[PDB]
Amino acid sequence: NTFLSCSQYHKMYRTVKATSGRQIFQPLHTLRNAEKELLPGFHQFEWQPALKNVSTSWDVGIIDGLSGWTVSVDDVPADTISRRFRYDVALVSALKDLEEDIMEGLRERALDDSMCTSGFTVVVKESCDGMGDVSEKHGSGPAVPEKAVRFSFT
């Protein structure tokens, strides 16, 4: 939430560590470990029926966006840089994030919990716009750090 570094975090960490007698912040690696569940690709799940032409592998995290674009020069170039998830894995991550509030709302709605297993309709908005010719530092020889497009949902 504060855009701090990895290094700088550890710096001020060792600082407060030797400062007043306690391990007030956790160091890096334990923060990394604790976080790795908050990313996509941690919760196991299923689909009924099974997915259409989708690998049932779940625990995967970040994929490379080219989707196995055969890099051979003869064909259309395959240099296009891209990153994404498995859409569905991102969805299950987002949903299990919100599960706390869904459980709160079920508490308010007083619906019995042995009756809240099937009838859920999540409405999902999605969006896709491009941010053009972005400015970024230390380019004296162009490396296409300009035209980006961000796929998103809510």
Q: Which residues bind DNA (CB under 7 A)?
A: 5-8, 10, 13-14, 17, 23, 27-30, 32, 129-135, 137-141, 143
Does the footprint of Ca ion cover residue 146 (CB under 5 A)? no
List the beta strands (DSSP E) in 1-154: 63-64, 83-84, 126-131, 148-153
Interior angle at CA 48, CA 44 and CA 53, nearest 5? 85
Identity of the residue, 125 or 137, whose beta carbon is nearer to DNA in the bound complex: 137
**Residues of span 125-144 touching Ca ion by CB under 5 A:** 129
Does the footprint of its own copies cover residue 11 (CB under 8 A)? yes
Does the footprint of other proteins cover residue 127 (CB under 8 A)? yes
Q: Residue 129, annotated ligand binder?
A: yes
C-alpha span between 102 and 116 (Å, rounded): 11
Are 91 and 98 spatial neighbours (Cβ–Cβ below 8 Å)? Answer: no
The listed partner (its own copies, other proteins, DNA, none) that binds 125, CB under 5 to 8 Å by sort, is other proteins
C-alpha span between 62 and 58 (Å, rounded): 11
